[PDB]
Amino acid sequence: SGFRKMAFPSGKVEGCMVQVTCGTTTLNGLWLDDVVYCPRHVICTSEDMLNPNYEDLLIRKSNHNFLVQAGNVQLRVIGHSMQNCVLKLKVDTANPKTPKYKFVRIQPGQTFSVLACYNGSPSGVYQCAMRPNFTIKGSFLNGSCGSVGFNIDYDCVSFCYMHHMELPTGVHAGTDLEGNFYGPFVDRQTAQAAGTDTTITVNVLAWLYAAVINGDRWFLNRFTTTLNDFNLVAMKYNYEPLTQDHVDILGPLSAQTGIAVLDMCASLKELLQNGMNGRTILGSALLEDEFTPFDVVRQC
Amino acid sequence: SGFRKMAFPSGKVEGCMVQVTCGTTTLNGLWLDDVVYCPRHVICNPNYEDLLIRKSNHNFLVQAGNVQLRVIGHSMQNCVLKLKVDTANPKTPKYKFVRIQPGQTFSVLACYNGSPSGVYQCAMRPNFTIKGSFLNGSCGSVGFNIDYDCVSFCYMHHMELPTGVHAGTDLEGNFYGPFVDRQTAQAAGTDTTITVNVLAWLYAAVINGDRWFLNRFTTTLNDFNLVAMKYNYEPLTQDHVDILGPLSAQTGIAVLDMCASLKELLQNGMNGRTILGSALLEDEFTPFDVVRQCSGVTF
Ligand SMILES: CO[C@@]1(C(=O)Nc2cncc3ccc(NS(C)(=O)=O)cc23)CCOc2ccc(Cl)cc21
Ligand SMILES: CO[C@@]1(C(=O)Nc2cncc3ccc(NS(C)(=O)=O)cc23)CCOc2ccc(Cl)cc21
Ligand SMILES: [Cl-]
Ligand SMILES: [Cl-]
């Protein structure tokens, strides 16, 4: 029993964290086999950030301009290339601690663990979700760039995020491990802002099914709803549209609890209308949207 | 910016998790040097000295990854079983066994069959239970803090209470709380809110730019404790006020000035507003957790 925001064990990722320095800029890198992956803005100064020409800044660099430190050991850079917004530094030593891994690009609503690091040293691990507006509500101070997001299934680490920047509202933006940003963001200090964020509906429903599995049914009602009527109501509360794919994905949780997806939708409609009336659901006074259907099945 | 419930990196502890099987019971063990520590109920009104004397070393099967460790000795220390093995753990980190106080926080590496599945942050409640996330097979999972390169082990999971909360021991086998390792009618006592932690979380909210709850008022320690007692909040001591000193100096909000803000939140609610994305007052971040997360301390 119990339901917590749970992160994956971070050990396999801790053994990949290195410090990357170029000039006066120091950030984190991910060392897998003989390559160190890091944000390409490590080659920029503060002035360069307004309109940097990364190809022009990179051509002026040689291998020995990049200092890579793994623990108390200096790695030698023997090659470098840029792939989108990621810099790939070829080193002379393969990481003996390289886990079994994949690079995966995730969709909004998906969750992952973040290993926050400073100077190539891990400081903490937390769980979060890719928001519908493609930002993440993380906890990152200056120097955390290059910290990574991941999931672990079986013995395989799936890297899905690399941290690049903090937006003016305090939220964070980054890329997949191929250096493609999530969202309409650029690694430029131009006027950028997070779009209006919405609640991840399929995740709130999964969390309501987790509450039922743990013995809480106070919020259920005798009503049902059509998918279209549910969406017309939910959009009025800034909730993401619920698609047929979402209904299909909730199938297993519906079968385990005996409550139809559209009946759980009717319960959500009523919670949005009434609030909690001094009550909590799984120890929370707000409707939680950072647990996916997959996370609920895994933890419960 | 940002404030998350953050756990310590679990790598140093992952390298110590093993599977312990005795008869039909399988749980988790902690392998440090040549000893495996696990709950003594793995041998199970039990008489543990009588149940243990009937066991031989080969009755305990210890699995570290895909390798069987051979048990060469066994002894009991309070509610923990210590299994001497032939191989010292080459991944043994620098460590200490520490007993924590209610209100203190720690990371839990939840394990099943000696395999870590997740890491989360929690606090030892004033009633000595922990609000964890544990299923059958999680016994022997451990709680810890990391300071510098040293792992301080503070908790080992033993059981779940009827309200869904959890009970366990320190690594010397002494239970936290009035609990026993037997199937008997046991219940969590009435819990209270950890006041010093709620104040630390209010200082974290101010540091991150949330100030709507601040007011022009201050209070005295005695008046605040009369209010705290009414709302099932733990008494705030002079030690708590001293511990909040650094956060008070950084934000310019005196501890009894923040107590006056907390009194207003307790008497009037939040009025549709939130603090760090929460509609409840959070008490599972200590003053040290707030300082550590708002400064980026590494391990
Ligand atoms: C070079 O990193 C930038 C950045 O967003 N860094 C950060 C990432 N995470 C957390 C942070 C917390 C605080 C902070 N403060 S400050 C005064 O801006 O240095 C910066 C952070 C600095 C600001 O401009 C940009 C513009 C684009 C890009 Cl892709 C990166 C950055
Ligand atoms: C032997 O383990 C006991 C136990 O509390 N285990 C658990 C620990 N954590 C999480 C759990 C979640 C669910 C669960 N379900 S069950 C198997 O139907 O009891 C048990 C859990 C269950 C029997 O009563 C006792 C009596 C004393 C002791 Cl110290 C332990 C236990
Ligand atoms: Cl995805
Ligand atoms: Cl409140």
Q: Please provide the DSSP assignment of B118-159 as one string.
A: EEEEEE--TTS-B-----TT-TT-EEEEEETTEEEEEEEEEE
Give the span between the Cα atoms of B242 and A147, in whole angstroms: 35
Residue A174: CB atoms within 10 Å: 30
Angle at B290 between CA A195 and CA B109, to 5 degrees: 90
- Chain CA centroid to CA A186, Å: 17
Number of helices (H) and strands (E) in chain A: give both, helices first.
8, 13
State the structure-solving technique.
Answer: X-ray
Q: What is the three-class DSSP state of A265?
A: helix
Helix (H) / strand (E) containing B206: helix B195-207
Residues A256 and A221 in one domain: yes
- Of the candidates A45, A140, A173, the one whose C-alpha atom is nearest the C-alpha of residue B293 is A140
- Which residues of A are less than 8 Å from B119 in CB distance? 6-10, 125
Q: Is B297 part of the contact surface with chain A (CB cutoff 8 Å)?
A: yes
Number of C-beta neighbours around residue A63 at 10 A: 13
Give the residue from A173, A197, A221 where a domain finishes: A197
My answer on whether B290 and B196 are in the same domain is yes
Question: Which chain B residues have a beta carbon less than 8 Å from that of A170?
Answer: 1-2, 208-209
Is the same domain home to A206 and A298?
A: yes
CA distance A79 to A94: 14
Helix, coil or strand: residue A29: strand
Domain boundary residue, one of B93, B108, B138: B93
Domain shared by B127 and B30, yes or no: no
Write b or e for each residue in A75-86: b if 16 or more Cβ atoms lie within 10 A of its Cβ, otherwise e: bebeebeeeebb
Which residue carries 């990481």 as its tokens?
A95
Q: Say how many Å lie between the first and final Cα of chain B, rounded.
A: 20
CA A293 to chain centre: 16
Query: Which ligand is the nearest neighbour of the Cα of B274?
Result: 4
Which B-chain residues 72-111 have CB contacts (< 8 A) with chain A? Answer: 109-110
- Does residue A34 line the site of ligand 1, with CB under 6 A? no
CATH value at residue A204: 1.10.1840.10
Contact B118 A172 (CB under 8 A): no
- Give me the sign of the Cα torsion angle B102, B108, B112, B114: negative
Does B201 share its domain with B137? no
Closest-CA residue to A209 (of A161, A261, A171, A173)? A261
What total number of domains does chain A contain? 3
Take residue B136 and report the two structure tokens written for it. 């059958």
Ligand 2 site-directed mutation target among B28, B42, B139, most atoms within 8 Å of CB: B139
A141 contacts: CB under 8 Å, gap ≥ 6? A118, B1, B294, B295, B296
In this complex, do A124 and B6 lie within 8 Å of one another by their Cβ atoms?
yes
Residue of B nearest to A139 (CA): B2
Q: Are residues B139 and B4 in the same domain?
A: yes
Calculate the alpha carbon distances from A6 to A86, A113, A126, B109, B153 in Å.
29, 8, 8, 10, 19
| Element housing A158 (H / E) | strand A156-166
Residue A79 and residue A110 share a domain:
no
| Residue A171 contacts B, CB cutoff 8 Å | yes
E strand intervals along A94-155: 100-103, 111-118, 121-129, 148-153
Contact A210, A256 (CB under 8 A): no
Domain limits for position A85: 15-99
Q: How far is CA B275 from the centre of its chain?
A: 24
A165 within 8 A of A40, measured Cβ to Cβ: no
Query: Do B122 and B165 share a structural domain?
Result: yes
Q: How far apart are CA A65 and CA A60, in angstroms?
A: 10
B4 and B152: one domain? yes
Q: Which two tokens stand for residue B85?
A: 């093995």
**Nearest ligand 2 atom to alpha carbon B158:** 29
**Structural tokens at position A41:** 């803005």
Residue A48 Cβ inside 6 Å of ligand 1? The answer reads no
Smallest CA-to-CA distance from A50 within A37, A41, A59, A58 is with A41
- CATH number for the domain spanning B130: value is 2.40.10.10
Alpha-carbon span B89 to B266, nearest angstrom = 50
Same domain, A175 and A33: no
Judgement on whether residues A188 and A280 belong to the same structural domain of the protein: no
Beta bridge pairs of residue A80: A89
| Parallel/antiparallel/unpaired status of strands B67-69 and A121-129 | unpaired
Q: Which of the 8 DSSP states describes residue A168?
A: T
Helical segments of A187-260, H only? 201-213, 227-235, 244-249, 251-257
CA-wise closest residue to B40 among B83, B81, B98, B86: B81
Residue of A9, A116, A280 lying closest to B118 (CB–CB): A9
Same domain, A299 and A228: yes
CA torsion through residues A274, A280, A285, A288, sign: negative
Closest CA to B153 of B82, B90, B95: B95
Beta strand spans in chain B (E)? 17-22, 25-32, 35-39, 60-64, 67-69, 71-77, 80-85, 94-97, 105-112, 115-123, 142-147, 150-160, 166-169
| A127 neighbourhood in chain B, CB within 8 Å | 4
Q: Which residues of A are catalytic?
A: 41, 145
Residues B198, B190 contacting (CB under 8 angstroms): no
Helix axes B195-207, B255-268, angle to 10 degrees: 100
The resolution in Å comes to 1.7
Question: How far is B108 from B111, CA to CA, in rounded Å?
Answer: 9
| Distance separating alpha carbons of residues B261 and B283, to the nearest angstrom | 15
Task: Determine whether the shortest distance from the Cβ of A164 to ligand 1 is under 6 A.
Answer: yes
Whole-number Å distance between alpha carbons of B101 and B191: 15
Report how far residue A61's alpha carbon sits from residue A76's, in angstroms, rounded to the nearest whole number: 15
Q: Is B191 helix (H, G, I), strand (E, B) or coil?
A: coil
Which of the following is catalytic: B38, B41, B166, B240?
A: B41
Last residue of a domain, one of A99, A122, A142: A99
Which helix (H) or strand (E) covers residue A68, if one does?
Answer: strand A66-70
Residue nearest to atom 25 of ligand 2 (CA): B183
